[PDB]
Ligand binder design. Structure first.
Ligand SMILES: C[C@H]1O[C@@H](O[C@H]2[C@H](Oc3cc(O)c4c(c3)O[C@@H](c3ccc(O)cc3)C[C@H]4O)O[C@@H](CO)[C@H](O)[C@@H]2O)[C@H](O)[C@H](O)[C@H]1O
Ligand SMILES: [Cl-]
Ligand SMILES: [Cl-]
Ligand SMILES: [Cl-]
Ligand SMILES: [Cl-]
Ligand SMILES: [Cl-]
Ligand SMILES: [Cl-]
Ligand SMILES: [Cl-]
Lengths: 114, 114, 114
């Protein structure tokens, strides 16, 4: 799976250990081996949420399966919780787009997962 | 909804108030309240369109509904118009990807919109 | 197509001519006119793959058609090959998400491709 967070919070406000915490917590939440979890954090962005520029985040989670109504609710609680605790972003200023990828549409290691 | 623009134009060329203008224009075009519109502008990118690094943009609009054939034509006129007037990018060097999101696949505020 | 690569490799390690090579090789692999191919490279990113911040890349390829099981395998060999040769990223640390876009969902030049 792949998790991306884009945020206006400055780089200096991203704590040590943040990528590792995302990797570990997403491995647990998705049930996928951590060796297959990729994470990407993009601070210092020019962004607004509802026309205001308090801390906010726009995120995506792509996974081959492990995406659905109840699962996505659980991921949103986990991820908003981490962004609130670690980046001080209010959960009502976070969007996370979830993508259930077909295996044939995910390239890796000179091929796809199909 | 979420609107993202990635462009090679320099940050100094993005006018003050551009994020607010995008927020309000997207609220009007989509019929969604501005409180739910997020906008993200990424200048200074390393990008080419047709092999040329003249000003260009790669954009996305994600929305729960309000996406379709006629609506997307109207959004493209609006958004290319704004990128041309405000960032001096030719409409023929802009791509906009439109995504009609299922409510269950959009996380927000510790849950999803489902 | 349009192709985006996000990587932790530093900007100074992206060789001259890389965007051109991507544009031309994508033209060859898809048969699409190069004048409409868009490429975007984002170096210096804060990212991990399997918990490690050795060189890695997270990419997307969007196309209207020209996406499928065999085609995507061929694109992954081409693109991983380029990322390994030019950016020194191991193919097993690359993900590429493939998107088959409906023409009505791609805006360009004040309209859509529908
Ligand atoms: C060339 C000519 O052709 C006609 O457009 C045709 C469209 O042409 C292209 C040609 C391309 O090279 C490229 C296009 C589409 O999409 C870019 C793209 C793809 C996915 C994205 O998410 C974002 C961007 C990638 C690119 O490389 O391709 C079809 C599919 O075959 C359509 O059915 C559609 O008929 C119209 O007359 C258009 O005005 C005129 O310029
Ligand atoms: Cl996956
Ligand atoms: Cl898919
Ligand atoms: Cl929405
Ligand atoms: Cl419509
Ligand atoms: Cl969806
Ligand atoms: Cl294409
Ligand atoms: Cl589509």
């Amino acid at each position: 799976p792949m998790f991306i967070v884009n945020t206006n919070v400055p780089r200096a406000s991203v704590p040590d250990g943040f990528l590792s915490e995302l990797t570990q917590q997403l491995a647990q939440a998705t049930g996928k081996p951590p060796q297959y979890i990729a994470v990407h954090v993009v601070p210092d962005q020019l962004m607004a949420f509802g026309g205001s520029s308090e801390p906010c985040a726009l995120c995506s989670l792509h996974s081959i399966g492990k995406i659905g109504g109840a699962q996505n609710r659980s991921y949103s609680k986990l991820l908003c919780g981490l962004l609130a605790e670690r980046l001080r972003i209010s959960p009502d200023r976070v969007y996370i787009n979830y993508y259930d990828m077909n295996a044939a549409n995910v390239g890796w290691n000179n091929s796809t997962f199909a």
